Design a protein around this ligand. Sequence first.
Ligand SMILES: Cc1ccccc1CC(N)=O
Ligand code: NA
Length: 330
Amino acid sequence: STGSATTTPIDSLDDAYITPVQIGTPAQTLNLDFDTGSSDLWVFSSETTASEVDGQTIYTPSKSTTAKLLSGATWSISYGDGSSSSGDVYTDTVSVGGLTVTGQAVESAKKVSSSFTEDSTIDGLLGLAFSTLNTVSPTQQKTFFDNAKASLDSPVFTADLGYHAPGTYNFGFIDTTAYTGSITYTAVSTKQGFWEWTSTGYAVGSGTFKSTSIDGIADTGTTLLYLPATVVSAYWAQVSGAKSSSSVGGYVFPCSATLPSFTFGVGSARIVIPGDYIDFGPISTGSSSCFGGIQSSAGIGINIFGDVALKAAFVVFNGATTPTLGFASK
Ligand SMILES: Cc1ccccc1CC(N)=O
Ligand code: NA
């Protein structure tokens, strides 16, 4: 089997991407944030505290003939940005892009933090990291990918995110029309439950490539590129008037600037992030200070190849017995 779904920016900055997901019978379509940095499929629901819902579409398990309470199971998650949700668990039929899983754990939110409530465009998350991170207790549950894997034509999914445009998530096949050149595969460590890999180095603009190992995660649910402070300083040093602002919470630059590209290594291959991808616009409405898309990881504990980086590539998440990542230009 295979599946193929379009993923769409939630706003003009590509702050996140939503993908329609069918849950239940008859189908209830919710727009979920596909997140390769977490492992819970959770949704706004008929159980979510009413004051914490503001425009989301909700899953109502009582309207699904295939929903079953997973008796005694609870979940609770906290994300890198300080956001959180928790609740109880149903099993139900879940379909993405024509690929169906029966008996998928659907984590129904009873509580969500303010950041979720304030985003009407995101009805929940679909985690695509390793199932060892799933938070369901007392019986840990599998991701949609892990449940689909044995049925897929190939045990893979691919992320092809757009710059200010829709893109695609495919399951079970590699669309050879979706990228240019060849795919370079690189080793993955699953020790922390992430798609963790080692970049071979970087370049700023037309500058020389610096060969250096940068260990980080491929995380579709993180907007920006978070790298070591040395790398980030070297990038922003090439932008007149850029500075790190403690008041704003990262590097800002004059909105009059033209940003250089950023290149990262994948083995002997190179992925180029155009400068425009690194512009996240005014820090507040009407400001002439703009927020940068490359930020320091120093206060995180891990480097994160988030959407800024991933949207510059066709990315293969190879879930074979020994997982690997693949990157191609596009
Ligand atoms: C949308 C999302 C994804 C991962 C973590 C947290 C969020 C909420 C946010 N807007 O900061
Ligand atoms: Na921000």
